[model samples]
Target chain A: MLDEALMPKHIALIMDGNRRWAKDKGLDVSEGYKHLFPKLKEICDISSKLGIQVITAFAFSTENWKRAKGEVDFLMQMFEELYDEFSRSGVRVSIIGCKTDLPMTLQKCIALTEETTKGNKGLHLVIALNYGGYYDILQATKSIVNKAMNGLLDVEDINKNLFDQELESKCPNPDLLIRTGGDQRVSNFLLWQLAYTEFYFTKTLFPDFGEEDLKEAIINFQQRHR
Target chain B: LMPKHIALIMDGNRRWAKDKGLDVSEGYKHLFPKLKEICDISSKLGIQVITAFAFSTENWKRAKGEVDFLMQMFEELYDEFSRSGVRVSIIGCKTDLPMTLQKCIALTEETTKGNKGLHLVIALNYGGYYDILQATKSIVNKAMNGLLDVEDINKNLFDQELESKCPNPDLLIRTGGDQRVSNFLLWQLAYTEFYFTKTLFPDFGEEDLKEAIINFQQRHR
Candidate 1:
């Protein structure tokens, strides 16, 4: 049994190995989404029921744009359906990262989905679409420069708190980061937030990462102190 | 087994010393000798750079007696640092350091500035978020001074202004059982492979580092 008082306020996920699993199963890379979509919804429910407030998933990265157009097109379409499924499942959805560069249809879906599930009191599902921690820092810096140039904010007053307020997400920083597929690296995900977070690396592919894997991670996390 | 630059989070020194019925300062006693050994090992292994987290911004909150001992220890360590045949540089907010320690840091850097051995980067009073803030301030100050524009603010400029202008580490080996990064090198470790060991810092030795390098090479393969 998990100690409720020790429960993490936020958990970040680096979901990788989808393509490898698809290849192993003799299916197209795009076919992996079939399993990943529903698995995410199930995780959202489990996380919420366990009293975790925030779950930020690294759904896509800025580096992912280097993939084949076929794969990118497939992912864009699946993300629309993914948002629809989460919205219908009563999950609060918020997509962080660059969106203006995204396809018009996908952008429309994101707006409607966020509004549709904005009021749900369950897990706050924050997804990264074309996001990179490097980009987030740079974007924050750009905002700070703009503020100083506009003479609205004094440059001397800038500090960690002010810089954080300008980052992409207003939600709390991740308390624990769970990276799957056996990678022991962060892969440019949530650099600013994972400053003091306990990391739990698992060998299981994200598509196959179920409630049991999540539970084991939380159990391990409960064993650590700041 | 080779990495151009390797980062280390040296931790659990106080716990190790206290468990052995020694003064907490005993935990830090082995720091300079241990670093020299690692420097030799890294140089022989063809590693060009080694960044070690000697003190963090959070460490300022440690017990006053312990902190006082650390400052004295730092002065002595930096004094002995110049003779190790390795080029040394100190990162973090040097202005915040005690006046005596800052002078030692200055002398240590200049004397060892041209050594061709291993480049040892020591982090004192450093935090990843703090580094980001510093970098941001520099960028804004430049923009406000009519030297650059928002369009000039990109990854290239950010990396140049970052304290660790060296390339990101290929591997980060953190001693101590804990898996937290503890706000060291936040921007620099974007994709660096991590080796988190349960051994405390004082107890960590050459053999342990060899094992870590083996593991790191295996990962690369």
Candidate 2:
């Protein structure tokens, strides 16, 4: 039986396929990204309406920055514009992972957005601007060790749930992990949190994802029996 | 929440001793002493039950000499359990096993039946998928016999049929740098948290164990 009112509290998305979408249409890569903006808005609106508390989008990974410089710059510009617009839309912006590695201008904008919406009790929108699950685990481990060395915590007191407190955000456990671009494996997004999470993969490009696609994903989630 | 039970994939035993230029037996031999230390540490840490993968169902496919030696070691370890205050139990389906081996496992379990300390579980010839299937079959058989209801197939009912008579693992640790859980405790780990480390099994001391616990405590709800 499907629980119509019961939805996943935290939904993590691996948004993939801008370059491939552009290549398929024989257009410039920027054209693919241009179409993604409306898609993001549509999904966000649909998810918020469905009563999903948190929606985490993998905007750009740390490894993605190593690609062509033009693409990276374009992404930063897009994120900055999106951050400014979304900050006032009842969505609380929270950035995950190493923010220091990000550009100073982008970091300032992100911090400002988070601070501005710190009081908002509406939908929590998490953006993984520069994140990797392995790096997140590594950094969290380092922090745990540092705390132990300083006598604040005992190393023997470490466990899985303890590791999560050190991560960038303290959001609820992700209930369903969705990956676009047809990837079968998790590429370092919330490694510790996805231990028992249900996974869904789609070949749809980020620009092609919309409210209907998200609704389909939620329907799949509803059908799973714990 | 405090983990009432924990599971470990004891990995890197051979690698740890081999890196020191010792024979494979020396690597395997180090585990018994380390096992005692970890058992005491777990007891002191307030964990009621601890399960370990001593021998997997896949281990039978390994070289003959190694398997014999490991089985022999198991017998020797069973002989010493009286002094260690740890209760020994073998988990996994035994009907498929050779009758002689099953008798030996049964005897070891009977010998340590009354210990009051740590409830130690040795997953000999065990696979997580196999455990779940066997439990489901038992549940179905009970239903056919009119002894169990179909609605009584939730977590608690399923757990009562699992080995060691303990709750599911709240925390699962895999040593030796392996990130995947392999085939360990599939249904049991549905909500169980995981901790992985590069430290070998023989070298994983109380500090490593504590570090894992601290990591668990810090995870957000």
Candidate 3:
């Protein structure tokens, strides 16, 4: 019953429950992120094959900095390595978030990956690092205000399309948002874009979410009326 | 298990009616009385604010008969809820609503202006995007008029410009199997905990609501 025409053009994922997955498997917390990279690669490959044009993943959040310093360091290192790993693929990689507070090495990796993949015509991979939905909206509002002060834009011009162009991600509003690890809330992922997006929540942990799970989610999404 | 504010996306009324071999207006008819029951339960539960999405901007795209029925229902519900000792506040744009519904909205708010119980907010002809757009426009207007400096505008200021008198929802529950917010309270639900249930709106009663609140309390706490 899976229809190719009904497949989502844009898909966002909240890859949660990593620490819980690690604990369940009696492994170190670092091991959770280690498994995540390969799984992400597999997911991107599968999604691309399934004709999904854009994929955005919540790799890190503004609230993640509250975790232990060692865990933060490990995540940063993983980001650097994942950038290099994903760069080799034909996907267009874009890091969407506030880059000011990121470490110098990580920021460089982000810039380099974006520049290298600028010409790639394959799947669009967006990594949300140090991102918060509120932060994104606030920044967009500030940018719009700046335009208004400069006389380039009027208050009447501030509509949904104008506001959307200022957002960090350039992709269309997500058609299906898949969140693994059982939590039902969006957890500050793409707030504005998800107004009417179908949400698929699964108890399966992120690392354990395979191609079949994604297919089932897509099927469930197809069944729902927008 | 008490949240200061509770937001609801009341879905599946039409579906419930269709399933029961009744007209869609019958679904709305069932929903009107349920609102009173919910407001009573929420007030007794010590919830300060209860905002419900009764209609959306997209809902106007529905069949003319259904849309007309909903408008008539809103007018009647407003008069009924206004006299029930609850302070009823109508959020969303009055300009987008019909003339009669607009008058009913104004009358309902004026009548319940002094009530000391639950702050019941009904969102008619509302969309989260539209709300945010209107808020942004208001802020931009102030800045353009030289009444407020661009630097003075921030998240706190933006929040004040929003139409809702209540604070952001601590818990948002959507009944009727759907998982999406369907354009309900996006800005206000930024950090809100969500609870989704398959129970259709007509079948969703006080017990079902209590269960949702208990689940919300466990997760939020």
Candidate 4:
């Protein structure tokens, strides 16, 4: 049995290999997204039960916009549907990304879900859509500059803690960052916050990741000193 | 296989020495010569830059004896590297270091400033957060002083303010089986490929590095 005290407070996931998983299964890439919806609910349930307070998943990236139009459209539709379902599932959902560039209907869907789940005391589910770590820093820096120019903040007061408040996600820095599909790089995800976060990479695709895999990763994390 | 810039986090020195029934300082002693050998090989291979994590800000909390030994070792290595024709650039906060070590850093940089060989960057008393914080502070100061406009402070300008003049690393290798960045080059490694190995730092040789480069090449392309 894993110790509750050893569980990471904030866990982040780079949901990779969805397209490859689809290819391996001889299905359309859209099917990979469809198959992942239920898996995400199960993973969130398991995480909340294991004492995780916040869970962040990389749903889409700024670079992901360069993908096929059909794929991008499917992802936007899937995100809208997922937010609607999660809002009623007792999970507090928050979308962390630039909403101005998103489609109007998808923006409304995100706003509605976030408003509905704002009062829930359950697991904090953060979806990073159209996000990039450098972009996050850029946005945060711009905010800081605005404040400094308005005389609301001092330039000398700029520090890591202050910068963190300007980021889209207000959750604590992640304790463990898990990337599926065998990629070792952070892939422009949570650059500032992952300063000391332990990284775990697995060959298992996102759709195939389950409770057992999460348990194994937590056990491996427990074995490390920090 | 050749990467334009390669960054390394040299770990497991103490553990390697412990396993061999040797003193931790002995492991560190083995590293200095090994670094010289690797730098020569990298230079000959047409690699442009090599950045290494030598000592971190957190490492100051270690034992007094160990810290003193490391300071002395750094001083000695700087003297030797000055004559090796490797242009050494020291990154991180110099104010946090002891005056003696700071003098050695100055000496090394001044001595090797004109070298035409590979650029070797040593990160001492460094933390990724601290590096970013300092760079941000410098940019903010320029804006406040009216020398630069805040509107111009984009990613490219921010990169110019950083201590590292080298291009973003093509490959980052961390030894000792740990799968963490440990606050090394947080901003610069935004898209760098990572290669983690279980081999201890003392045991990691040129051949091992070649293998890492090959693996990186296969994945990067």
- The fraction of correct interface contacts reproduced by each prediction comes to 0.92, 0.00, 0.70, 0.66
Error of 2 at B208 (Å): 40
Candidate with the larger lDDT of 2 and 3: 3
Off by over 4 Å in 3: none
Summarize candidate 2's per-residue lDDT along B40-150 as a digit string, tens digits: 999988888888887777778878988887777765665556567788787876765666667777876787788888888878778764564455456545654667655
lDDT of 1 by residue, A130-195 (tens): 899998999999999999999979988899889778988655788889988888999888988889
Q: How would you encode candidate 2's per-residue C-alpha lDDT over A1-226 as one tens digit per residue?
A: 3355788888988878887899898999888777654566567777888888888888788678778999888887777766656767777778887788877888888888899888888788888878876456445545554565467776445654565577664548678877777544455566556654666778787888877677788777776534
Index of the highest-DockQ prediction: 1
Between candidates 1 and 2, which one is better according to TM-score? Answer: 1
Instruction: Judge candidate 3 at residue A181 and give its lDDT.
Output: 87
DockQ of each: 0.90, 0.02, 0.71, 0.71
Error of 2 at A167 (Å): 1.9
Candidate 1 chain B lowest-lDDT run of ten: B76-85
Q: Put down candidate 3 lDDT per residue, A59-140, tens digits, no spaces.
A: 9998889989999999988888866688888888888888989999899989998998889998998989998787788788
Off by over 4 Å in 2: A169-171, B1-221
Query: Of the candidates numbered 1 and 4, which has the greater lDDT value?
Result: 1
**In model 1, what is the error at residue B122, expressed in angstroms?**
0.4
Q: What C-alpha lDDT values do all the predictions have?
A: 0.88, 0.72, 0.86, 0.86
Interface RMSD of 4: 1.3
For candidate 1, what is the DockQ-based docking class? high
